[PDB]
Amino acid sequence: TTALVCDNGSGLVKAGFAGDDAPRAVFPSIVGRPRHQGVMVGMGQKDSYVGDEAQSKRGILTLKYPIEHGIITNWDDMEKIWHHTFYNELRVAPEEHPTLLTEAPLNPKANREKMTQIMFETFNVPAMYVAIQAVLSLYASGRTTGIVLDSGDGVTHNVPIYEGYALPHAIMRLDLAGRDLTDYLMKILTERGYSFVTTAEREIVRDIKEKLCYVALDFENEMATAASSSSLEKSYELPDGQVITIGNERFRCPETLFQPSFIGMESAGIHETTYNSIMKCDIDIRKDLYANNVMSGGTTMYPGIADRMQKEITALAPSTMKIKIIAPPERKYSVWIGGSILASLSTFQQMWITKQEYDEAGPSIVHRKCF
Amino acid sequence: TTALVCDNGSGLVKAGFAGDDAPRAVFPSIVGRPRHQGVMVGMGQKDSYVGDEAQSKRGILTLKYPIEHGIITNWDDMEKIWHHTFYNELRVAPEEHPTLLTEAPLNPKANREKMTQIMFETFNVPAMYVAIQAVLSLYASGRTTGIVLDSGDGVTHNVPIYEGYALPHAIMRLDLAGRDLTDYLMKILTERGYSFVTTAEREIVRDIKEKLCYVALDFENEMATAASSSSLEKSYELPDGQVITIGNERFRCPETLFQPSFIGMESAGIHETTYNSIMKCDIDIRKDLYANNVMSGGTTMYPGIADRMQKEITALAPSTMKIKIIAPPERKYSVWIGGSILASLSTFQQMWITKQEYDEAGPSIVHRKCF
Amino acid sequence: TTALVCDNGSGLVKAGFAGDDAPRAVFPSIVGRPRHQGVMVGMGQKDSYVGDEAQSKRGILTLKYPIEHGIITNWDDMEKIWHHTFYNELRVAPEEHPTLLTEAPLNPKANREKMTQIMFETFNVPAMYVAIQAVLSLYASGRTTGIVLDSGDGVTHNVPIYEGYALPHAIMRLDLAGRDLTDYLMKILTERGYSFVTTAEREIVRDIKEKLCYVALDFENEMATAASSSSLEKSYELPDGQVITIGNERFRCPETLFQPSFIGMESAGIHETTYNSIMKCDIDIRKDLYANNVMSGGTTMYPGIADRMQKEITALAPSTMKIKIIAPPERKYSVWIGGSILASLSTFQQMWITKQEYDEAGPSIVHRKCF
Ligand SMILES: Nc1ncnc2c1ncn2[C@@H]1O[C@H](COP(=O)(O)OP(=O)(O)O)[C@@H](O)[C@H]1O
Ligand SMILES: Nc1ncnc2c1ncn2[C@@H]1O[C@H](COP(=O)(O)OP(=O)(O)O)[C@@H](O)[C@H]1O
Ligand SMILES: Nc1ncnc2c1ncn2[C@@H]1O[C@H](COP(=O)(O)OP(=O)(O)O)[C@@H](O)[C@H]1O
Ligand SMILES: [Mg+2]
Ligand SMILES: [Mg+2]
Ligand SMILES: [Mg+2]
């Protein structure tokens, strides 16, 4: 049969079929409900909206994310999103297809236990499997050795792998990702008199961040350049026709990744996190780890982030080591591509958690069979 | 059965049957009583006259409007007018027909409470409903999204609606409409030596306003043109054969809608009111609101008012927005047409306030069931 | 010398001298201009009126607030108000006194830049400083640890402080305050047939709100009590002798603070805002924050608001935490009292921005020296 690969991220849902080169369905992972009163009768109105239909009508809706920091917090909305993905986007029968799901490392066990329970009971899938997103990203690049830096909307994490072996004690997890950057940009936009307070306005700020933000190679030099002249300013048109102009915010927003103290976090930056993850591994594999830094996720798509990470890691690493950052242009879907590749492999077909095994063992079997 | 749609405006009464394309009965909402002494015996004389019979004999009558600024102030005369509408104009049995009534937004609650009480007790209707006039106007145009500018004889108001959802906090209400314009024209006609002081003469001034007034595209240029020559002057024949000539008054009278300060009001014009109502809505629906400005009411029938409103809103709106004014030729009866359409809908048949519900709950049920 | 403390709020101006226990001058921050025509010659008439003189003659004036939502929007009127405060109220020479000014957090930078420029150029003050209002309120209570809820006429904001250290990432700002409540009461007064439309009538509605509104401990029980009987009704006399009676509106008006959806806002209430601000701080300071909730501003003077906030925060906080609301009877002037205390401190005398520093650095120095 044909397996289903579903990457349930905090911000976007990636779904498709195993063997394909790109995900079939990509849409935001949101559920919207009306907050005003309906005075017009005879027209089709629904109590909830999911995905693009919620984005289109966001002006009269309150938008909620069921997944927060890679943890599912509203299982009703998550089930609604899964139903939407299975029926309206891919248009498939769930019980006729094994499904591969993704999860961030160091997550609560109950999250994947409930994922398995929902998949086996509500949708009655024949088989399912839960994988780590960082390993799938390594699969997508055709590599067996390297350290993967994956940063999406909720979670940023590092996983070092050498010759197909993972070192769990060196796994790092950070709760700073895209959504936090969007909130910080939303806060700092008030310096120029721009006020965004609603969940519909938050999406507008996210679009502005995606379309106008970049990572500066040197932060203080960029600050001086922005203070000296107006060559770095850009204009953006709001949906109602208003035009806003932003200056140093464009690179101030992504700077939080390297300086988490901008949002009040004591943790270190992504470069120092990667260096510490490398230094926790055996001395005989650090040289290979230094040359196989793999980037994945939407938050790694800022212009100039790879050069900045290269510079920082070079400044941290010994001068005789060769630092190489791997940033494929398609790294936005590396997790899904690796999941499809894994589901297409012949040797993986006996690693599926089947319905019989679940009926015998309960939801706890995902701990024994998956990682 | 067949539902009855009655639009009780400040100036005119519109009545008919649901499913019809036009109101069956249209007549002024006035009650007249003699003010001289009857010296002739043996002839049929009545203590009161309603509607067209009052208009025909206005020379010996004092005319009173029971509705003032969309608020009923004389319930005895209002009951007389309702009896006239039910029995002499439509010629129907009130207890055999559900009745749909209209009301302006931001009205006193006691007004509709007494309307419901009168309908259920005096006329013993089986069911009744009170709708908002601007919503019905939106129904008449076959739209679910737009901002409605309704201006009749007593009230001018704006109601923005998006995807069938109303935003009550953005609803505007103005107490400048046709009657105020008639009074202002009555006052300014004294500059040419014309004196109208009675309620019968006020009707003559209203006819003059309806037949000779228009909205100037640019007020000061029209002023200069009227001062330069006499190309804008028109002649009107009084009922007794006298002929009057008016110049700049023709467009001075409707100018009060855009400059309320002409009658001593501090409020802004209709264009600024519409712009402020649009700006109070969510940023993601303002573009659709800009292109769906719907006009309704008799006061919107001045020649050239739509172009003036388009110009003003374009001058107020951002240059990249598309401003479109919708002014149907039948907008004089948009409220009644929308009411008939709503009463003809199948899904509305369970929204009627029935006699049993009124007997159970009292007059206050109209607040819970209607809007 | 003697420093000047000026608290420029959206609704009122508080001014005086450092070291005093109360502000010397309190008057509304309004500028009024005549809207009728002057027909009497030989009498003293002015083109503008400021403060109490504008309030006294409001019947023939249009009233404008130069400050909107803590942001100065009319700098000419603001300069007129500053001139009035300096010369007619305090009767002092501006160049002989350093001046301390206040501002709300998360404000546009250009606002304080222009404030500094106006103070240094137009009035030629020797030194000036801009402080955050919530910090000054904490100064007034003799505390170094606590979370301050300040709500005036334009802005409501929360600032948590622990051991003299502020956590900027946990600062909350809300654009719902007294003026919005006045507008909502103005809108809901139409349910009883009372119509207030002018800026002079808006002041009357504000007086009614100040004199008759209170916060209900339980909203639905108060609704049921008001519906059952008339024990909650009060009477108010209009300036022309008319008497109005209001029922549930008295506590419906302040309820918008806890339910912003009454005016169409998606944001949460003040209690939930305070709880979220507390939860964003470090876990080791939340216990001290829970017991030091400080109220400040005119909008916190509603009867029963402190008990309602205590109940809500207790319902939100863990059952083992001790919730304490600090509501001094003089919290109406807490910002000014704290500003005077700060200006009287010996260690603050070197934090003044002096004329030499401004001449060297330009208006941008307020960003580097102030917070
Ligand atoms: N061009 C871009 N520049 C910066 N950030 C981006 C860009 N495109 C997407 N993002 C951000 O990436 C995040 C979503 O990416 P994704 O890896 O799909 O996250 P998740 O897997 O958590 O859904 C969002 O926060 C989005 O704003
Ligand atoms: N052709 C016209 N030009 C200008 N005003 C008109 C015209 N026809 C009617 N009116 C005015 O419209 C008002 C009544 O219209 P209508 O919408 O029926 O009001 P209502 O619903 O309050 O009775 C009256 O003031 C009348 O003078
Ligand atoms: N007793 C009261 N009850 C309720 N509101 C009040 C009371 N006294 C003053 N206010 C309101 O407080 C606001 C002004 O207080 P203030 O803290 O001086 O604001 P600002 O600093 O913005 O001028 C006004 O909206 C006023 O109506
Ligand atoms: Mg992801
Ligand atoms: Mg009408
Ligand atoms: Mg204040």
Residue numbers in the entry:
A (entry chain C), B (entry chain B), C (entry chain A): 5 to 375
From the paper:
Actin polymerization powers fundamental cellular processes, including cell migration, organelle dynamics and endocytosis.
Replacing KH2PO4 with K2SO4 produced intermediate severing, suggesting that phosphate specifically caused the substantially reduced severing of ADP-Pi–F-actin rather than altering the buffer’s ionic strength. We therefore used cryo-EM and iterative helical real-space refinement as implemented in RELION to determine the structures of ADP–F-actin and ADP-Pi–F-actin at resolutions of 2.4 Å and 2.5 Å, respectively. Notably, in ADP–F-actin, four water molecules displace the inorganic phosphate’s oxygen tetrahedron. At the helical-lattice level, the refined rise was slightly larger in ADP–F-actin (28.1 Å versus 27.8 Å in ADP-Pi–F-actin), which accumulates into detectable differences in subunit positioning at longer length scales. As is typical for helical reconstructions, the highest-resolution map regions were the filament cores, which revealed a continuous solvated channel aligned with the filament axis. An analysis of solvent-accessible pockets indicates that the filament core is accessible to bulk solvent and features small channels that connect to the nucleotide clefts of the protomers. This positions the filament core to contribute to extensive solvent-mediated lateral interactions between strands, which occur at a vertex between three subunits (Fig. 2b (top)).
